[PDB]
């Protein structure tokens, strides 16, 4: 059966400004099947209060979900997105870069 691997994008809604409130996003897309694990990490630890958009797909049937959460950037802090799918042998981890 078809197995498309997820594109991972970790970013913030508004440009990061240490101190100012924001939303940390992790956008996963183009994967298939839809069964997928997504986590937002703060300094390595998994973040609890994390929601996700409703399962949906594009013209080619590949799925796409948005994982977001409220957060407040800090110079010292590091956030990342950890994702898993059948197409991934091991959890893929992407670091957040306030310029991507």
């Amino acid at each position: 059966m078809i197995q498309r691997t997820p594109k991972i994008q970790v970013y913030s809604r508004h440009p990061a400004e240490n101190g100012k409130s924001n939303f940390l996003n992790c956008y996963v897309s183009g994967f298939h099947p839809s069964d997928i694990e997504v986590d937002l990490l703060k300094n390595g630890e998994r973040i609890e209060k994390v929601e996700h958009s409703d399962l949906s797909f594009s013209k080619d049937w590949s799925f796409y979900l948005l994982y977001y959460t409220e957060f407040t950037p800090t110079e010292k802090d590091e956030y990342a997105c950890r994702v898993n799918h059948v197409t991934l042998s091991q959890p893929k981890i992407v670091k957040w870069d306030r310029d991507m």
Binding site: Y11, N25, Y27, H32, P33, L55, S56, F63, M100
Partner: protein, 275 residues
């Protein structure tokens, strides 16, 4: 500009552990307005956009009624296909359905859809004439047969060129502030040196709506297509979308490069240049 209303349906069989999971969502352009989740508590069509919460209990009782029927339908679909392909009832499978309509700037019918996909492969789809079907294999062909006798196409045609369009328009009106809005992107440029002889040029397109956009890089006027890092247009999460494209540049040539932005909300196309 033209608009559309689409309904995305996803059903996944989870053998040995309950009833197949069914998710349903619906859009008007790039804004989701309703959703239904078989595993949710409400067991009801729920709103996902402000401009629909207005709709009274009739709408919600009706859509909750129809959405449940769809769920059951695709709950059966899994069975049928499982047999059409002599598949082990142990494995989990997926069924996806997507139907809807498009209208031009004139808000008049412009084309409709109704397509399926089993485990990610195109199964059956309605052709443009809205009068015929595209079967992929023998299985889809057998379904095409059923739908031919049942005169499904004709019925679907009425929905697509009629009811469908009419609701799009209604939603379009009731949601003028959102659905009929436009937000030209907020474009800016970032420059970070990769090394003592190269630098990265990032062109940003933020807080824009709808999602349609064209972000391009050019050196001395020539498209730098194959040398551009172009991420997928993503959702800000606030109803607007973002996107960026970057190119690695030989320190000292930044001025040769230009970023080009194209969005339905820009009086004229943008042209930025680092300097």
């Amino acid at each position: 500009g033209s608009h559309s209303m689409r309904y995305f349906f996803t059903s996944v069989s989870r053998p040995g552990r309950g009833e197949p999971r069914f998710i349903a969502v619906g859009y008007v352009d790039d804004t989701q307005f309703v959703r239904f989740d078989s595993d949710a508590a409400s067991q009801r069509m729920e709103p996902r956009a402000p401009w629909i919460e207005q709709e009274g209990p009739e709408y919600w009782d009706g859509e909750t009624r129809k959405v449940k029927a769809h769920s059951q339908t695709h709950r059966v679909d899994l069975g049928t296909l499982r047999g059409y392909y002599n598949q082990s009832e142990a494995g989990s499978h997926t069924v996806q359905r997507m139907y809807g309509c498009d209208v031009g700037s004139d808000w008049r019918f412009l084309r409709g859809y109704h397509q399926y996909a089993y485990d990610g492969k195109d199964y059956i789809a309605l052709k443009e004439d809205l009068r015929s079907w595209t079967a992929a294999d023998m299985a889809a062909q057998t379904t095409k047969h059923k739908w031919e006798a049942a005169h499904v196409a004709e019925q679907l045609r009425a929905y697509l060129e009629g009811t469908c369009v009419e609701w799009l328009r209604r939603y379009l009106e009731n949601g003028k502030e959102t659905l009929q809005r436009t937000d030209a992107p907020k474009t800016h440029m970032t420059h970070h040196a990769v090394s003592d002889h190269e630098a990265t040029l990032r062109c940003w397109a933020l807080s824009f709506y709808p999602a349609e956009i064209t972000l391009t890089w050019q050196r001395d006027g020539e498209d730098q297509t194959q040398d551009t890092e172009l991420v997928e247009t993503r959702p800000a999460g606030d109803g607007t979308f973002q996107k960026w494209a970057a190119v690695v540049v030989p320190s000292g040539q930044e001025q040769r490069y230009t970023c080009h932005v194209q969005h339905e909300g820009l009086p004229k196309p943008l042209t930025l240049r680092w300097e």
